[PDB]
Amino acid sequence: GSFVEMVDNLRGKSGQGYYVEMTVGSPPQTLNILVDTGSSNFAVGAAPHPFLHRYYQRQLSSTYRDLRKGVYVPYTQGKWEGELGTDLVSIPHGPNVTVRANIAAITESDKFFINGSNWEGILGLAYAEIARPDDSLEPFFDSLVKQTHVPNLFSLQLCGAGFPLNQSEVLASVGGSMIIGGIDHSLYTGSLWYTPIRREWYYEVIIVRVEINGQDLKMDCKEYNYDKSIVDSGTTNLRLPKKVFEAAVKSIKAASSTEKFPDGFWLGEQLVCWQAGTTPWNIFPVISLYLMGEVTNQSFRITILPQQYLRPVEDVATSQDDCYKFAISQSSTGTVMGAVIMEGFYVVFDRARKRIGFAVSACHVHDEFRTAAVEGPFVTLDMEDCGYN
Numbered sequence: 001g002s003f004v005e006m007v008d009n010l011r012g013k014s015g016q017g018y019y020v021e022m023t024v025g026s027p028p029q030t031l032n033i034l035v036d037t038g039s040s041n042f043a044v045g046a047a048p049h050p051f052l053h054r055y056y057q058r059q060l061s062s063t064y065r066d067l068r069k070g071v072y073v074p075y076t077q078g079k080w081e082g083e084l085g086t087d088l089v090s091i092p093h094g095p096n097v098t099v100r101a102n103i104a105a106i107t108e109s110d111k112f113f114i115n116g117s118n119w120e121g122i123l124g125l126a127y128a129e130i131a132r133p134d135d136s137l138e139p140f141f142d143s144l145v146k147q148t149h150v151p152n153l154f155s156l157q158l159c160g161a162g163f164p165l166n167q168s169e170v171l172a173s174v175g176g177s178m179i180i181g182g183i184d185h186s187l188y189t190g191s192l193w194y195t196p197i198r199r200e201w202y203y204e205v206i207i208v209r210v211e212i213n214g215q216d217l218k219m220d221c222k223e224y225n226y227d228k229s230i231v232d233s234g235t236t237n238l239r240l241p242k243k244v245f246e247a248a249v250k251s252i253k254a255a256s257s258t259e260k261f262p263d264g265f266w267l268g269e270q271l272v273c274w275q276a277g278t279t280p281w282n283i284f285p286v287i288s289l290y291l292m293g294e295v296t297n298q299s300f301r302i303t304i305l306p307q308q309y310l311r312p313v314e315d316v317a318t319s320q321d322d323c324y325k326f327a328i329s330q331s332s333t334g335t336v337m338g339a340v341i342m343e344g345f346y347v348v349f350d351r352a353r354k355r356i357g358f359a360v361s362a363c364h365v366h367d368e369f370r371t372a373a374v375e376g377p378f379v380t381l382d383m384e385d386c387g388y389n
């Protein structure tokens with residue numbers, strides 16, 4: 001019910017990532033690590049880089065083991081090379097356990113580390129199927145569960161501030177909670193609703209309906225999950241398949257049409273600013289994603305506000321204006337429920353029961369008139385048909 005040792009153990013923000021403190025090696029080396037539900041490698045900076053203030057020094061760890069194998073990891077935007085090994089790993093604000101885990105020691109990288117992000121490595125929390133270089137490299141959470149009595153479950157509360165944080169404020173500020181092995185009831189309101197994990201690779205789910213201000217987007221539900229839909233704390237935006245993105249943007253523009261925004265805003269590139277305190281939240285629609293439920297022919301919905309999908313940013317000029325970027329963008333690799341949508345919800349990664357739970361976050365940003373919601377049930381037929389093959 002209560003996991004006080006782990007509450008408030010995250011820092012960061014949607015634009016640069018949420019991270020947890022970890023230690024690696026003997027004696028322990030402290031590093032800040034991105035929480036990434038959309039990948040499956042534990043990978044840490046292990047050599048000097050301009051954007052790293054510290055890195056893993058394998059030669060100073062008595063418990064370091066060399067696996068004598070390189071890994072080359074190219075992403076769409078960014079890449080790194082590293083060397084595989086194992087070492088003892090702990091999470092200080094975590095379960096009181098130490099485990100031996102695989103670590104990819106990053107020795108070279110391009111456009112991977114983010115200037116000012118305050119993290120030095122990534123904790124891939126998804127499944128072995130998508131680990132690099134192959135599925136034989138046991139992910140961290142798998143090791144944790146196998147080596148300890150920690151329950152096979154974790155839960156994430158990512159806390160968006162609702163305003164920009166300077167790098168001073170972002171260091172001093174609590175960014176949320178990763179509860180390892182449990183569900184903390186203080187982090188949510190109302191009921192938890194669960195959707196099945198379709199397959200254990202990414203945290204893949206099935207979206208069965210989409211509404212903008214209650215209006216059905218009315219696409220074939222396969223389009224919403226083309227070629228998959230995942231829950232991904234290591235992606236900033238809500239990302240939608242091209243066709244869904246075009247339909248959603250058209251509907252959001254129509255709902256918000258009392259104000260005209262430039263193409264660059266809708267493309268997620270350009271900020272828009274309002275006089276301090278005057279952001280017209282009410283002109284922007286709510287977005288509801290309906291997810292397959294655990295009961296046959298049953299769905300539920302999660303509803304987010306513009307306070308979720310408009311990401312606060314600092315003005316390019318010097319001002320007291322309230323400024324934002326549109327944090328919904330197109331994808332060619334399926335739907336990605338990124339950090340901006342996770343900030344609305346307490347999300348339970350129930351690996352043991354192959355399901356993901358959603359509840360309204362106790363730290364979601366809202367106004368006096370509307371809140372994020374998790375509601376059900378709804379009768380929905382032929383939901384397995386919504387899955388892309």
Ligand SMILES: C[C@@H]1C[C@H]1CNC(=O)[C@@H]1C[C@H]1[C@]12COC[C@H]1CSC(N)=N2
Nearest residue numbers: 014015016017038039075122234235236
């Ligand atoms: C939210 C935060 C600001 C973003 C930066 N994200 C990353 O650097 C994530 C670790 C890197 C990766 C690792 O595999 C693919 C790559 C992109 S998508 C994903 N979930 N993880």
